[PDB]
């Protein structure tokens, strides 16, 4: 509604790096705002594709920004008759980022790693990793807790069971405020999909340069299935946490299986233990059902309630006949202990191949009326097909049916404005929360500044 | 805490067999690899072998293939050391040993159990 | 298998001293080593992993380096309780071996 869309703040980064792929908000251990950005096809040292991550100084102006530093060298350690090898091109540095604290996660899901063994080996496959930084110690770890050492052989004998050699993790990621790290790997256990967790105090204090493979004790990985309703099902493409059972000490889990009993989709909310609480079907096939979640009380019950985005669903329209456009579901959360019931309310794209519900960001309370509200992303939408952002305020009842103010992309087509999202932060410091979208395609950043009601 | 907690000195005839305990206090005997060590005045240190208790998969230094033998049971989270024929060149004494962080160190180290072979 | 020659045998020196044991390898290691403790009629204690990195609890006077297939382990400004054996393992190949050992004593 407030959101200015007259006077933007534009960052950029190199031609090709899709820089904006990923963002988020940080806050260095003054509170002032910065915005880190995933570029995960920026060249390396060896002019080929590796990613790379980059921390914005908030200017009204925007412009360049520095880069936050990463080792990009590939690694081998001969050790224990064995031979450790990983393999940072095309790994995709950047194509997922997040803040906590004084520190940034930035993940690149598609490191390879082997493990040679005389003529046998592992099979080199994207175990994935995530970097992590405190940006002014310079303090450096790294956290793939799917690198194994187990070779081929052992997985045929076992038929690929508790194979997480293509985790992919930190595909998705997300921190709760206690500081644990949580990863999406939604190829793990034979992309079954997987949830890797860790504290991010222990992921410090456990690595160190060259080992490779380290004990993490603290962590704590979800759980292979025999059940072929997981199968290919990509459990853990998107991740998000909230408080959904009422115990205000635990922590629970929202995880995205965009591909759940054949590509139906699922959505389902876990606690700390990964032990299901809830599961949210998908309404038609292919829609991608869980392709993006988000979490945030748009109702001002004080309960979290539960956003998913199905950005391929096709409406039914006159004469029978299907149109893709997207579809986000709102949930919310009942009054103590009960089940999510039905959606509360049915958003559903316009534009033909819009992709509305790619992407779900909470804006915190941008009108400043006592209800959060949220902003829907359609990277291929509007009447130009060059991408738009809705917003929706909240209401007693849940979320407003219709758009508050639509944001059209100031880029060129195909930058996919709006594929990421970030919002509830103000950066300016006017007191109203702010808004940040990327648009990897054409290698920049947006920033639009909240003002007050007009 | 980490406390591995070996079973106590033993003294057996040449010719039989002993079974050494290592069992995991503070942690799951699961998580790494255990290792067993052989240490003699004269001799020094020699690695026996490790095992995998998440598994039961093992190495052994050819020098002990056959008289040591490496088990572990991850129900009374404990892992064994089997030793047969025994000679009076057993005699020794036999810790069990975990790493800390780097998957193929040697840091966490039990009290040691001491074995005498005498007729 | 890989010999792991540790010298010196033993040594006499006093507190705060600052002295130095190595370690030469048969082959390069590539600084998959470590270094143990072992106090007078007690067990082992882990000191170094990885060649360079303490293990969580030992004092920062202890102070490991090296490369290839020599190495060193230093300990600045010796204490009383430090008097005790010191070994070096390899761990880059099976079997696991050790150095032969070497003692520190008091001197007088």
């Known amino acids: 509604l407030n959101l200015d869309p007259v006077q933007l703040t534009f960052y950029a980064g190199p031609n090709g790096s899709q820089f904006g792929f990923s963002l988020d908000f940080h806050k260095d251990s003054h509170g002032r705002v910065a915005i880190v950005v995933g570029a995960p096809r920026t060249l390396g040292p060896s002019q080929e594709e590796t990613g790379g991550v980059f921390l914005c100084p908030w200017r009204a102006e925007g412009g360049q920004c520095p880069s936050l530093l990463f080792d990009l060298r590939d690694e081998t350690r001969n050790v224990g008759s064995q031979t450790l090898q990983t393999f940072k091109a095309r790994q995709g540095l950047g194509a997922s980022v997040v803040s906590w604290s004084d520190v940034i996660v930035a993940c690149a899901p598609w490191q390879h790693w082997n493990v040679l063994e005389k003529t046998e080996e592992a099979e080199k496959t994207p175990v994935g990793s995530c970097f992590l930084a405190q940006p002014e110690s310079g303090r450096r770890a790294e956290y793939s807790p799917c690198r194994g050492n187990t070779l081929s052989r052992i997985y045929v004998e076992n038929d690929f069971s508790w194979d997480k050699r293509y985790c992919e993790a930190g595909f998705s990621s997300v921190v709760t405020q206690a500081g644990e790290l949580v990863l999406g790997a939604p190829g793990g256990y034979y992309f079954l999909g997987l949830l890797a967790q860790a504290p991010v105090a222990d992921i410090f204090s456990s690595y160190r340069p060259g080992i490779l493979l380290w004990h993490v004790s603290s962590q704590s990985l979800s759980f292979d299935s025999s059940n072929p309703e997981y199968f290919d099902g990509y459990w853990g493409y998107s991740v998000a946490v909230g408080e959904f059972d009422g115990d205000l000490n635990t922590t629970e889990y929202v995880v995205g299986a965009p591909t759940w009993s054949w590509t139906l989709g699922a959505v389902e909310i876990l606690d700390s233990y990964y032990q299901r609480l809830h599961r949210l079907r998908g309404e038609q096939m292919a829609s991608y059902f869980g392709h993006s979640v988000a979490v945030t009380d748009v109702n001002g019950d004080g309960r979290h309630d539960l956003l998913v985005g199905a950005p391929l669903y096709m409406e039914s329209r006159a004469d029978r006949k299907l149109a893709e456009v997207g579809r986000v579901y709102l949930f919310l959360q009942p009054r103590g202990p009960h089940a999510l019931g039905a959606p509360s309310l049915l958003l559903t794209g316009t534009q033909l191949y819009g992709r509305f519900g790619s992407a779900i960001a909470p804006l915190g309370d941008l009108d400043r009326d006592g209800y959060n509200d949220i902003a829907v992303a359609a990277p291929y939408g509007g009447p130009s097909g060059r991408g738009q952002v809705l917003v929706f305020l909240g209401q007693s009842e849940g979320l407003r049916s219709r758009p508050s103010q639509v944001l059209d992309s100031p880029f060129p087509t195909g930058s996919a404005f709006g594929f990421s999202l970030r919002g509830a932060v103000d950066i300016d410091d006017n007191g109203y929360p702010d808004l940040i979208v990327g648009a990897y395609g054409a290698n920049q950043v947006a920033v639009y500044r909240a003002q007050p009601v007009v | 805490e980490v406390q591995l907690q070996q079973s106590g000195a033993e003294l057996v005839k040449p010719g039989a067999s002993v079974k050494l305990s290592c069992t995991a206090s503070?942690?799951?005997?699961?998580?790494?690899?255990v290792h067993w060590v052989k240490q003699r005045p004269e001799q020094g240190l020699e690695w026996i072998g490790r095992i995998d208790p998440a598994n039961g998969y093992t190495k052994y230094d050819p020098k002990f293939q056959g008289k040591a033998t490496i088990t572990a049971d991850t129900s009374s989270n404990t892992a064994y050391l089997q030793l047969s024929s025994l000679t009076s060149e057993d005699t020794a004494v036999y810790y069990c040993?975990?790493?800390?962080?780097?998957?193929?160190?040697?840091?966490?180290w039990g009290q040691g159990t001491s074995v005498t072979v005498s007729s | 298998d890989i010999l792991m020659t540790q010298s010196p045998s033993s040594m006499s020196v006093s507190l705060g001293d600052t002295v130095s044991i190595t370690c030469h390898a048969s082959?390069?290691?590539?600084?998959?080593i470590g270094w143990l403790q072992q106090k007078p009629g007690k067990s082992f204690m882990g000191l170094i992993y990885?060649?360079?990195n303490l293990v969580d609890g030992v004092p920062s006077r202890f102070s490991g380096s090296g490369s290839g297939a020599d190495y060193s382990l230093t300990i600045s400004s010796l204490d009383s309780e430090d008097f005790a054996d010191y070994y070096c393992?390899?761990?880059?190949?099976?079997?696991?071996?050790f150095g032969g050992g070497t003692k520190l004593e008091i001197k007088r």
């Open positions: 082959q390069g290691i590539s600084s998959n």
């Open positions: 503070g942690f799951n005997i699961k998580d790494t690899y």
């Open positions: 990885y060649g360079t």
């Open positions: 393992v390899q761990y880059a190949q099976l079997p696991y071996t």
């Open positions: 040993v975990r790493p800390l962080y780097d998957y193929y160190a040697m840091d966490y």
